[model samples]
Target: QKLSDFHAESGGCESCHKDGTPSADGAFEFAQCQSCHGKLSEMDAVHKPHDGNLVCADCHAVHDMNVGQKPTCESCHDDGRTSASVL
Candidate 1:
């Protein structure tokens, strides 16, 4: 799906996609995202450690609301059989 489909209504592209454009160098800031998701530092263990290092879009398909449609633990930890770890 196109990335635009994932844009949140309140902030549009800048909501999670900082700088109003996507980039390869991790330009998206986690601080802007915390407004809706709560502080990443206080997230569950599965989410906390990934705060600074990962782009939310790296594993989460923002427009695909279904959890099953997004990346899963097995996507990374399935013994190299399912899919390689995006991490």
Candidate 2:
């Protein structure tokens, strides 16, 4: 299933956006994920580094990707790592 559809199963678009409308800068969306998914620092090593430098969507493409599909590390780092490697 699509990432959007997966989240929608829990609370719909309002889960991540205010009034179901995305912000122009995505600040709301970024903060919303933290509210529901926990702060980045509370996550694993792969997630810890992004605490100040990135948000969930920086690697996870919300609408264009799927639930089981892993986000690509090669997109930003050429370290040839996956989530398993980071963990």
Candidate 3:
């Protein structure tokens, strides 16, 4: 399912796609995530440094919502530095 399908009743296209459509740059602004999840900077330590230059959808499958398929730090950081070491 697409993002639109997931957040349909929430705000439809305007939820994340401002101006009722996708952004010109095509990047989902972090502000959209913050609007619902609260300020990323003020979030847990694991979500702090990842505030900038990181897309929530990159790590989170908003439409899937499958815990087993969820992306883990090891997916990108598999050099022995596990999530346990980081957090």
What TM-score does each of the candidates earn?
Answer: 0.51, 0.90, 0.60
Q: Mind sharing the TM-score for model 2?
A: 0.90
Predicted structure 2: lDDT = 0.89
Error at 29, model 2, angstroms: 0.6
lDDT by residue (1-87, candidate 3, tens digit) is 555466767677777777776666647645687778786578766667777756677677655664345356767765776445667
The list of candidate 1 runs beyond 4 A from truth reads 1-7, 49-53, 63-70, 79-87
Ranking by TM-score: 2, 3, 1
| Per-residue lDDT of candidate 1, residues 1-87 (tens digit) | 444454445467777655677655544544555667786578766667777767566666555554346456655655653223332
Clashes of each: 0, 0, 0
Clashing pairs in 1: none
- Where is the poorest 10-residue window by lDDT in model 3? 62-71
Model 3, which residues run further than 4 Å from truth? 1-4, 26-28, 63-69, 80-87
* Candidate 3 clashes between residue pairs 3 or more apart in a chain or in different chains: none
- Ten-residue segment with the worst summed lDDT in candidate 2? 70-79
lDDT of 2 by residue, 1-87 (tens): 899889989898899989998899989999888888899988988899888999899988999999887787887888788888878
Q: lDDT of all the models against the reference?
A: 0.58, 0.89, 0.66
Between candidates 2 and 3, the one scoring higher on TM-score is 2
Q: Which structure among the candidates has the greatest TM-score?
A: 2
Native RMSD of candidate 3 (Å): 3.5
The positional error of residue 14 in candidate 1, measured at the CA in angstroms, is: 2.2
